[PDB]
Amino acid sequence: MAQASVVANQLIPINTTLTLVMMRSEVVTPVGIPAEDIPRLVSMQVNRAVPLGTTLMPDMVKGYAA
């Protein structure tokens, strides 16, 4: 396990536009969106509430493809 994923550094309400303070990088399982894509995610919207500490998955971000 060396691949880190993006996880929620705070509760992100449904339909929020993602900012950099909201995302940390952490080695978690299952693996979600790669931590190196945190720059690609700023200004995109999530389509559900993401509690603090939850791994961000591809299907949670509106318009994400990678």
CATH number of the domain encompassing residue 36 = 3.90.1210.10
Number of separate domains in the chain: 1
Domain housing 35? 1-66
Of 42, 39, 40, residue with least CA distance to 19: 42
30-53 residues labelled b (16+ CB within 10 A) or e (exposed): eebbebebbeebeeeebeeebeee
What are the distances in angstroms from CA 43 to CA 1, 4, 22, 38? Answer: 29, 21, 11, 11
- Alpha-carbon gap, residue 55 to 5, rounded angstroms: 7
**Spatial contact of 28 and 5, defined as CB atoms under 8 Å apart:** yes
- DSSP 3-state assignment of 28? coil
- Say if residue 60 is exposed, middle or buried (CB neighbours under 10 Å; 0-12, 13-18, 19+): buried
Rounded Cα distance between 32 and 53, Å, is 12
Please tell me the experimental approach by which this structure was elucidated. X-ray
Instruction: Give me the resolution in angstroms, 1 decimal.
Output: 1.6
